[PDB]
Amino acid sequence: VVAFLSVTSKVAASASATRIFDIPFYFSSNEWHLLLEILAILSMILGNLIAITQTSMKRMLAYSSIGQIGYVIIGIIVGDSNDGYASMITYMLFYISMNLGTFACIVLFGLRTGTDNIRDYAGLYTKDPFLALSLALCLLSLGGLPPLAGFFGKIYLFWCGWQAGLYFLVLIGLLTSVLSIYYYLKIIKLLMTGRNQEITPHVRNYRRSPLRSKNSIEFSMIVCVIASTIPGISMNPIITIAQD
Amino acid sequence: IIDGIPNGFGVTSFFVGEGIKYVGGGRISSYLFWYLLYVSIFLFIFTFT
Amino acid sequence: GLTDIEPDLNEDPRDRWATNGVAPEDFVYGKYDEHHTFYESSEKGSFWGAVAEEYNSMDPPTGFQGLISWLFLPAVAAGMYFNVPGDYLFIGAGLFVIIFCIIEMDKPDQPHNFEPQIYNMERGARDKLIADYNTMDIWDFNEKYGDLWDFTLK
Amino acid sequence: SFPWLTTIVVLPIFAGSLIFLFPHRGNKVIRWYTICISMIELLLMTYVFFYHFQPDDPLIQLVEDYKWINFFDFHWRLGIDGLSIGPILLTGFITTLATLAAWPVTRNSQLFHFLMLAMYSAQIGLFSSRDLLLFFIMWELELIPVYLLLSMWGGKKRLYSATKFILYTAGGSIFLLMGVLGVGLYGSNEPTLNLETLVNQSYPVALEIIFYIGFFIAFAVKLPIIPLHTWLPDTHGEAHYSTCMLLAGILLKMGAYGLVRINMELLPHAHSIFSPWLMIIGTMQIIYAASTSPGQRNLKKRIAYSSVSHMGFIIIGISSITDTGLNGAILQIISHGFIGAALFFLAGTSYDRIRLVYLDEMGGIAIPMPKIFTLFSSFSMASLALPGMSGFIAELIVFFGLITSQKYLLIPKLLITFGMAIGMILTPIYLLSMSRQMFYGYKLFNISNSSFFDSGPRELFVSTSIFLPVIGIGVYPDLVLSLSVEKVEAILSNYFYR
Amino acid sequence: QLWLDGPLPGLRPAENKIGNEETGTRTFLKKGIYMANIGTKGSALRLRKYAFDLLAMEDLIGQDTLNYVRRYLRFKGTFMYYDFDKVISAAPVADKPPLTNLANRLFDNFEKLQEAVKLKDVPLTRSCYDDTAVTLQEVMNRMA
Amino acid sequence: NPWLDLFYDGEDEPETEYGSMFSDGKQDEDPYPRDNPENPYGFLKFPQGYAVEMASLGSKVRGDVRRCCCVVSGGVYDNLLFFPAIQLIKDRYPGVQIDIITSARGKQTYEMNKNVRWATVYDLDDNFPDPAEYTDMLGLLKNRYYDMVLSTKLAGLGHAAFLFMTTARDRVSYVYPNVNAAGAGLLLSETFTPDSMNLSEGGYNMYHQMIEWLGRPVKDIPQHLASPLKVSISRKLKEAVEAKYKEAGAEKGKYVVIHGIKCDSKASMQSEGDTDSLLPIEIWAEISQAIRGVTPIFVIPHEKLREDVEEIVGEETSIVFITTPGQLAALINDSVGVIATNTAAIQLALAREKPSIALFCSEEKGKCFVPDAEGKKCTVIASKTGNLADIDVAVVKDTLKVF
Ligand SMILES: CC1=C(/C=C/C(C)=C/C=C/C(C)=C/C=C\C=C(C)\C=C\C=C(C)\C=C\C2=C(C)CCCC2(C)C)C(C)(C)CCC1
Ligand SMILES: CCC[C@H]1CC[C@H]([C@H]2CC[C@@H](O[C@@H]3O[C@H](CO)[C@@H](O[C@H]4O[C@H](CO)[C@@H](O)[C@H](O)[C@H]4O)[C@H](O)[C@H]3O)CC2)CC1
Ligand SMILES: CCC[C@H]1CC[C@H]([C@H]2CC[C@@H](O[C@@H]3O[C@H](CO)[C@@H](O[C@H]4O[C@H](CO)[C@@H](O)[C@H](O)[C@H]4O)[C@H](O)[C@H]3O)CC2)CC1
């Protein structure tokens, strides 16, 4: 349910915000532009700073979501002229796969393990290399790491911001993206601990079991997307600049 | 001195993050009060001044 | 190194820039420095015997692998001297590399090729592991001794 | 017609993606497959350099242009010239030898060799990229492999070193991205990122200066420039020596390559403005690192600070606006890629036996380990700018480029020429002392250290195969300079009156 | 003053009319070469020495090493061009026309040699270099 | 204080239940989540209704700790006296892993501890540390994910901030009694004010406030007390010290351990609350002349003192070089008696139940450091003038027949 409210709530609210700030409120653009600029700068600054001091995975993903929403807000701020709404989508489409994969891995890990603390994610690579690989790929896509969807999504979001002259917003986005590597790397640093003394008994008694399960298919439809959409970021925008 | 700047950046980032995390309280009444103070501030900024 | 017992901490400081050898007053000159420690002997072996022993101690490739590894460089030098096309040289070098690597993959595995957990098990169990890994297929080995590579199990 | 450069870039990462299909245990099959891929790729670059690269051509060669994203006008564009083929060959050589020297690695060998092949592909893609955003992507594509290599095969403080490295590189590379956005959006009609059409662009002085600063912050984070060098000592000291080859021989030269390709070529006016201030910075960097090196008790930290010191000659040759200075900078790039990698390799192999860190407790290693002593002394002599080695001729050509420079008049030309000279007084002072604290003196060693303790055939071959080009270039420097005498001249052709 | 501010100065035009008639400059000249200021005597000594250096270029002429011939020709040609300008500018007024004629013939030979090198024609390079050789021998005989 | 925690609404009502699962008991009693071998996908067996992630519930509801970080200041003596606190943490919180941060000398104390997972060396006395080392230690503490951190070091603002950035749920520390510790309690979950600027001035019960806070009765859990000091000696230490005293000529169960020879060595294992705990070698020779039938072994912390002893008590005596506290405890274990000045030797004798004689500079220090000497087979011979060199050798000679 929290994964649903992470991906479904932001899409509908983004659509409502775009259709309520452009159609009935275009005459007062100089006010809600400032409101959205404050709302985005504070969001990235106070969603990426608190996420690096988190001991729970779901809460860290919460601060992650309230950080990544500020990148999408730039698409509303720039407007429909310098792409803009075409950069809201082609990043929200990315964000859906990123968050649903990084929540599917959490779902499987919690179901087979029974925990939510980040400290119990140590040594998952030794037990389930596939799950650790998929979670690491989802988190690195979340951090905007190069060969994964978040990096191209962020450079698409920042190209329109620079084209519209919003140097402050793009600079804050890049600085907060730098801050947004320490987490999405802390979990991987835990995942690659071979120290048996630091491995929690939660993952010591971990049974992967010889069955596929439904979530594996659902996130195999996702992990192969956040990595292999990186060439297909020319097919998506021509469906998103066509709208106006 | 020279190496104190990046490590100082990291330490100050950690301290500010911890302070912002701990300063709220986690109570619902505090959540509502902080959610409403900034609404009042926005209303005073964009209408009065 | 490694200490099973906590070592005694250094109470007295030492100069960082000083030489770390023994003191010059404790130096046995002529012995610690190899200056009077070589007395000749009628029993000196053959030069080519020493060459062969040193070459064989490195465990050279033998057979076809030894043949190609011996004949690669003179063939390349002759081809470059005789102005033969270089594409043939590149084809030969690539074929030599691929053949050498495939032959080396075909060679049996040794105890030092595995993880320290696999190296430091019971010696008889390790010997049985090495004997099986070079005998049965990799899929049968993985379905039989797979759980030995879950290092968190123990 | 055939996509040679695309195949060269794609082959290592594509082959390493298939390393997870292997169900074998151990490291034998994985390392032999990886060395097969590395040697096949090396032969491919050798064929390209032999048959399709012309050193007399100052233009771009073997170009390939495939439109990938229409919105950014962004193309997968590849091309080589006299500037790039040297770093490309050095990347292939050093990466193959680092794969060969990483053979005792038995813990997570599959991931290790996959990351090595990914690093191969990323470095080659950077050195042969003719698109600004492609350059930025290939620049970014190494943050994760080096982070994983550090955090999983490093030293005692590997995790802090990896975090510091990735955060510092991201902090530089966001300025790199801002510079890319600024340069690629300056077009009045449509955005453009091709370097060929950007080399003729005209900017106002202030905007050119801002773009130069945006690129130079990144190229000073990567190529160590005072005071943006603090990531390097703990990153290189606490890394695996095989990874240290790529870190101190290849990744350090990428900042210099970006400085020539972007700062020196695309923006000549801002470079002429900034170069006299770069000369003082380079001289003070040489002095500062050559003075920091005696203060380091750790051996690898001393070698890392020596690398920072040696980068100052590259900075000087960049800032001295002559063909001779740029040729000396390229020669020093090649020389340092041949020297620092071997020094780090010898340090790691020696630590694998002695298992000691600080120099004040490693006396008498020359008695059980004489061959590594010989190689360490020879590579220290190469570091010492001794004639017969590439370092001496590189520094001499940099000195000549400063002396023959027309931008500076007399007194600075004196005070800089004296400056680096102080450096080659300070460079012996620690280096030999290092050897004196690492090999000289007598210590009673164990009998088990009498045999099967020295460097084997593999380590001897690696050290010899990196030492031989040093002698070959120190005897005949035009084995390297003749590849880039023409193109450098073209780079200089924009710095004179027209 | 410590350093130059604008772009570096290019090829300074000669004031003795030793350049090409149509262009005013020679093709083999290279910008950015450091010429030491010695004077008329030093320029004459360098002129003779570098004429000998260019007459040492028989071995470099070949099908595989024409680029190095062109590089050495441009380097030494710039050097002797500006040395010839210096020595003509300080020569007595009676001796200026023959020195200018000799310099013009030598630089025309330089252009012909560079043109032959550009087309990668070896017999043409050899013939043009033979004419250049007799002109260089005349130059050292004049300036001994 | 109202301005800090707005909307306090008092404490919890007496009828609040905090749910059913992970509510009462200890950490080892939780029945859920349990293994489900019948599940084809490896999912565990979870209770009806409850969310899958239940391991985080115990920290919020029951206040369970699984990893604890005790940053113990001082040398060998303080880290040794912290052993009952570590045993109290182990008893109160089953299955907990306890990591120790201390100095280089204090790290060797935990060689003979069965409860500590990691012992780490960190220069706590440096008020201006290296930024790289400080950042590395802080990141290490952050990455261990400690549930609770305790600090015996007197914490100012800087130490409180260092504990704050540890991301620990409970941050407990001793603070400075002066005004310089203002604002430190804001960043700490719990604060203790000692009776002096030196925590080691207190004796065996110097950590009594921390012991009381660790064993308080909360939520139908009975109050937990502190066990007497105990140590566990491994076989390697025993063999090493056996070789060490066999080179000195003594044999097993036929020697006594003399400790407290005056020297400038830092391995004397003294306490910061007793700086006078050293006796000159002449008084030690006078005392050891009265030993009959049992070979007196002199423990020297530095080899440079050895020759001095060889020219004070005699060349034909038994001298043993001990620097590591595990080796000292192993020597005391195989002995029959300990004649020690106020060092860690008398505490290890109390741990190994050996009859021993404690020489103190004052009676107050004697009763504070060993409050139960009479019960634990010890006689406290304290100097009547407050100076240890003014002790009378006649009383010690009379008392030395207990062995
Ligand atoms: C740049 C480059 C390169 C190239 C290089 C070259 C070109 C080389 C050459 C070289 C040469 C052409 C050489 C010749 C000759 C040599 C010799 C003749 C030598 C001798 C030696 C000896 C005899 C010995 C030595 C030693 C050792 C080994 C070590 C120790 C010390 C000693 C010194 C003893 C490459 C490809 C790598 C790649 C990358 C880039
Ligand atoms: C300069 C850096 C930025 C900033 C400086 C000031 C920093 C905070 C630190 C701490 C915070 O604490 C305040 O005090 C209260 C205690 O009552 C808390 O309330 C607790 O109450 C319970 C324990 O009493 C806990 O169970 C609750 O989780 C928590 O609510 C309250 O959070 C907070 O108001 C004040 C200053 C932050 C960094
Ligand atoms: C231009 C470089 C100068 C110098 C020229 C001479 C060069 C050596 C090369 C190698 C060696 O050839 C071999 O040496 C020996 C001859 O006497 C015979 O070996 C037997 O005599 C040795 C003499 O003590 C004994 O040690 C051996 O046990 C015994 O087998 C061997 O047949 C012959 O092949 C001499 C010329 C070096 C460079």
Q: Does the distance separating the beta carbons of F55 and A202 come in below 8 Å?
A: yes
Beta-carbon contacts of A170 under 8 Å, excluding residues fewer than 6 positions away, are A74, A158, A161, A162, D178, D181
Q: How far apart are CA F214 and CA F226, in angstroms?
A: 10
Taking the mean position of all CA atoms in its chain, how far away is CA A58?
13
Residue owning the nearest CA to atom 20 of ligand 1? D468
DSSP C72-138: HHHHHHHHHHTT--HHHHHHHHHHHHHHHHHHHHHSPP-GGGS-HHHHTS-HHHHHHHHHHHTTS-H
CB of residue B17 inside a 6 A radius of ligand 2: no
How many interface pairs between A and D have CB atoms less than 8 angstroms apart? 64
What are the φ and ψ backbone dihedral angles of F338, each rounded to 5 degrees?
-130, 125
**Tokens at F29, concatenated:** 């009693």
Using the structure block, give the residue that is written with the tokens 């390097």. D232
The structure's method of determination equals: cryo-EM
The enclosing H or E element of A206 equals: none
CB atoms < 10 A from the CB of A130, how many?
Answer: 13
Taking alpha carbons only, the member of F70, F50, F229, F245 closest to residue F144 is F70
Q: Does the distance separating the beta carbons of F136 and D160 come in below 8 Å?
A: yes
Altogether, the residues listed in chain E come to a count of: 144
**Tokens at D114, concatenated:** 């996959």
Using the structure block, give the residue that is written with the tokens 């910008």. E31
What sign has the CA pseudo-torsion F106, F109, F115, F118?
Answer: positive
Strand stretches in D143-214, DSSP E: none
Report helix, strand and coil shares of chain B as percent, to nearest 5. Answer: 85, 0, 15
**Tokens at D375, concatenated:** 């190689």
Kindly report the CA angle at D196 between D194 and D197, in degrees rounded to 5? 75
B6: amino acid identity, one letter: P
Q: How far apart are CA D300 and CA D434, in angstroms?
A: 11
Taking alpha carbons only, the member of F222, F285, F220 closest to residue F258 is F285
Q: How far apart are CA F393 and CA F290, in angstroms?
A: 10
Is-contact F382 F365, C-beta < 8 A? yes
CB atoms < 10 A from the CB of E56, how many?
Answer: 12
**Tokens at A156, concatenated:** 């698409």
Partners of residue F120 on adjacent β-strands = F101
The enclosing H or E element of D78 equals: strand D74-80
**Tokens at D476, concatenated:** 């005949």
Beta-carbon contacts of D153 under 8 Å, excluding residues fewer than 6 positions away, are D105, D107, D112, D239, D240, D243
Local structure of residue D211 (DSSP, 8 states): H
What are the φ and ψ backbone dihedral angles of D387, each rounded to 5 degrees?
-65, 155
**Tokens at C11, concatenated:** 């109470």
CB atoms < 10 A from the CB of F285, how many?
Answer: 18
CB atoms < 10 A from the CB of C124, how many?
Answer: 8
Classify burial at D263, counting beta carbons within 10 Å of its beta carbon; exposed 0-12, middle 13-18, buried 19 or more: buried
Local structure of residue F348 (DSSP, 8 states): H
Q: How far apart are CA D177 and CA D140, in angstroms?
A: 10
Residues of D in contact with F136 (CB under 8 A): 157, 160
Taking alpha carbons only, the member of A159, A154, A135, A125 closest to residue A230 is A154
Reduce the DSSP state of residue D164 to 3 states and report it.
helix
Q: What is the largest CA-CA distance in chain E?
A: 52
Local structure of residue F120 (DSSP, 8 states): E
Q: How far apart are CA A194 and CA D376, in angstroms?
A: 34
Is-contact E69 E117, C-beta < 8 A? yes
Q: How far apart are CA D290 and CA D282, in angstroms?
A: 12
What residues of chain B, 4 to 43, have a C-beta less than 8 Å from chain F?
4, 7-8, 10-11, 14-15, 18, 22, 25, 27, 29-30, 33
What are the φ and ψ backbone dihedral angles of E140, each rounded to 5 degrees?
-70, -35
Residues of C in contact with F302 (CB under 8 A): 11
Hey, is the C-beta of F277 within 8 angstroms of any chain C C-beta? no
Kindly report the CA angle at A224 between A218 and A230, in degrees rounded to 5? 135
Is-contact A40 A14, C-beta < 8 A? no
| HSE (side-chain half, CA atoms, 13 Å) at F94 | 6
Is-contact D281 D259, C-beta < 8 A? no
Is-contact D61 D53, C-beta < 8 A? yes
Taking alpha carbons only, the member of E80, E5, E6 closest to residue E46 is E80
Residue F77 backbone zone (phi > 0: left; psi -120 to 50: alpha; other: beta): alpha
Using the structure block, give the residue that is written with the tokens 């900078």. D329
Is-contact F8 F2, C-beta < 8 A? yes
Report helix, strand and coil shares of chain D as percent, to nearest 5. Answer: 70, 5, 25
Q: Is the preceding peptide bond at D58 cis, omega within 30 degrees of 0?
A: no
Taking alpha carbons only, the member of D36, D191, D34 closest to residue D102 is D34
Is-contact D165 D231, C-beta < 8 A? yes
Reduce the DSSP state of residue D263 to 3 states and report it.
helix
In D2-105, alpha helices (H): 4-17, 28-51, 85-101
What are the φ and ψ backbone dihedral angles of D286, each rounded to 5 degrees?
-60, -50
Is-contact F237 F255, C-beta < 8 A? no
Taking alpha carbons only, the member of F326, F327, F323, F354 closest to residue F340 is F354
Sheet with strand F255-259: strands edge to edge: F318-321, F295-300, F255-259, F337-341, F356-360, F378-382
Atom of ligand 3 nearest to the CA of C50: 28
CB atoms < 10 A from the CB of B37, how many?
Answer: 10
Classify burial at F197, counting beta carbons within 10 Å of its beta carbon; exposed 0-12, middle 13-18, buried 19 or more: exposed
CB atoms < 10 A from the CB of C46, how many?
Answer: 9
Partners of residue D80 on adjacent β-strands = D61
User: What is the separation, in whole angstroms, between the first and last Cα of chain D?
Assistant: 36
Q: How far apart are CA A95 and CA A72, in angstroms?
A: 10
CB of residue C46 inside a 6 A radius of ligand 3: yes
Q: How far apart are CA D265 and CA D493, in angstroms?
A: 10
Specify the resolution in Å. Answer: 3.2
Q: Distance from F157 to chain A by nearest Cα, in Å?
A: 20
F179: amino acid identity, one letter: V
Residue C40 backbone zone (phi > 0: left; psi -120 to 50: alpha; other: beta): beta
Taking alpha carbons only, the member of D316, D261, D489 closest to residue E31 is D489
In D128-157, alpha helices (H): 132-140, 143-153
Partners of residue D66 on adjacent β-strands = D76
| HSE (side-chain half, CA atoms, 13 Å) at F113 | 28
Residues of D in contact with F130 (CB under 8 A): none
Long-range CB contact pairs, A87-93, < 8 A, 24+:
A87/A156, A87/A157, A87/A159, A87/A160, A87/A240, A88/A14, A88/A18, A89/A236, A89/A240, A90/A153, A90/A156, A90/A233, A90/A236, A90/A237, A90/A240, A91/A153, A91/A154, A91/A156, A91/A157, A92/A10, A92/A11, A92/A14, A93/A236
Is-contact D182 D211, C-beta < 8 A? yes
The enclosing H or E element of A74 equals: helix A57-78
Q: Which of B20, B22, B31 to mutate to test the pocket of ligand 2 (most atoms within 8 A of CB)?
A: B22
| HSE (side-chain half, CA atoms, 13 Å) at F102 | 25
Q: How far apart are CA D209 and CA D205, in angstroms?
A: 6
Q: How far apart are CA F145 and CA A198, in angstroms?
A: 11
Q: How far apart are CA E7 and CA D102, in angstroms?
A: 49
Substitution target in D25, D29, D107, D465 with the highest count of C β-carbons within 10 Å is: D25
Is-contact F205 F186, C-beta < 8 A? no
Is-contact F218 F93, C-beta < 8 A? no
The enclosing H or E element of F75 equals: none
Beta-carbon contacts of A167 under 8 Å, excluding residues fewer than 6 positions away, are none
Is-contact F176 F197, C-beta < 8 A? yes
Partners of residue B23 on adjacent β-strands = none
Beta-carbon contacts of F193 under 8 Å, excluding residues fewer than 6 positions away, are F174, F175, F177
Taking alpha carbons only, the member of D371, D356, D368 closest to residue D446 is D368
Kindly report the CA angle at D377 between D372 and D382, in degrees rounded to 5? 125
Reduce the DSSP state of residue D67 to 3 states and report it.
strand
Is-contact D150 D164, C-beta < 8 A? no
Is-contact D130 D63, C-beta < 8 A? yes
Exposure string of D310-343, with b = 16+ CB inside 10 Å and e = fewer, is bbbbbbbbbbbbbbbbbbbbbbbbbbbbbbbbbb
Partners of residue F173 on adjacent β-strands = F151, F191
Q: Distance from B47 to chain F by nearest Cα, in Å?
A: 29
**Tokens at E34, concatenated:** 């450091």
Q: How far apart are CA D152 and CA A174, in angstroms?
A: 28
Q: Distance from F117 to chain A by nearest Cα, in Å?
A: 8
In A143-195, alpha helices (H): 149-163, 167-179, 186-191
CB atoms < 10 A from the CB of C94, how many?
Answer: 16
D450: amino acid identity, one letter: S
What sign has the CA pseudo-torsion E56, E58, E63, E69?
Answer: positive
D425: amino acid identity, one letter: I
- Nearest CB partner across the interface for D496, out of E3, E7, E67: E7
Local structure of residue F312 (DSSP, 8 states): T
Q: How far apart are CA C37 and CA C22, in angstroms?
A: 19
Q: How far apart are CA A11 and CA F325, in angstroms?
A: 64
Partners of residue D189 on adjacent β-strands = none
Q: Is the preceding peptide bond at A231 cis, omega within 30 degrees of 0?
A: no
Reduce the DSSP state of residue F276 to 3 states and report it.
coil
Query: For chain F, what is the radius of gyration of the CA atoms?
Result: 25
Q: Which of C42, C44, C47 to mutate to test the pocket of ligand 3 (most atoms within 8 A of CB)?
A: C47
**Tokens at A220, concatenated:** 């195999």
Please state, in angstroms and as integers, the Cα–Cα distance from residue A230 to each residue in A146, A152, D10, D64, F95, following that order.
9, 7, 15, 20, 46
Classify burial at F58, counting beta carbons within 10 Å of its beta carbon; exposed 0-12, middle 13-18, buried 19 or more: buried
A to E contact (≥3 Cβ pairs closer than 8 Å): no
Is-contact F349 F372, C-beta < 8 A? no
Taking alpha carbons only, the member of D38, D3, D45, D4 closest to residue D19 is D38
Residues of D in contact with B6 (CB under 8 A): 164, 167-168, 230-231
CB atoms < 10 A from the CB of F248, how many?
Answer: 16
Classify burial at F355, counting beta carbons within 10 Å of its beta carbon; exposed 0-12, middle 13-18, buried 19 or more: middle
